[PDB]
């Protein structure tokens, strides 16, 4: 199945030249679906949610212009064929959503990210 669309993300895309891109697309759409309730609660909007795979291996995600574009690494940085665990990707997704509000990695940022991580778990547990 195609995951239910998230009203708060306008478009998702994945890297078309990578192996198992069909899998990758299902994965980023499942991420989008799973965070839909949290985004509604926090009035978060994202225009583009897309996959990237930077040479810089420490790079896992990025937020361009407070949600205009969020980029997520979906694949292991030492093996293109292997996808990162859903838990890891969701963690990065919540990190980048926090940057819709807060730029620097200061107390405001970490406090908010901690609230989002906590709340997202409860949302999933209850299937909201």
**Cα separation, 71 vs 52, whole angstroms:** 6
Displacement of CA 115 from its chain's centroid (Å): 16
**Cα separation, 66 vs 121, whole angstroms:** 23
Q: 30 an active-site residue?
A: no
Which residue out of 87, 96, 115, 124 is catalytically annotated? 96
For residue 92 the two structure tokens come to 């990065």
CA neighbours within 13 Å on the CB side: how many for 117? 14
For residue 41 the two structure tokens come to 């609660």
Which sequence positions are flagged as catalytic?
96
């Amino acid at each position: 199945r195609i995951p239910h669309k998230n009203p708060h993300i306008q478009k998702v895309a994945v890297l078309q030249s990578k192996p198992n891109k069909e899998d990758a697309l299902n994965l980023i759409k499942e991420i989008a679906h799973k965070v839909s309730y949290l985004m509604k609660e926090n009035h978060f909007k994202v225009t583009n949610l897309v996959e990237f795979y930077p040479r810089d291996q420490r790079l896992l995600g990025m937020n361009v212009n407070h949600g205009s574009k969020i980029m997520l690494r979906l694949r292991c940085s030492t093996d293109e064929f292997q996808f990162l665990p859903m838990e890891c990707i969701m963690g990065t997704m919540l990190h980048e959503l926090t940057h819709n509000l807060f730029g620097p990695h200061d107390k405001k940022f970490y406090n908010k990210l901690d609230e989002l991580i906590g709340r997202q778990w409860v949302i999933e547990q209850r299937g909201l």
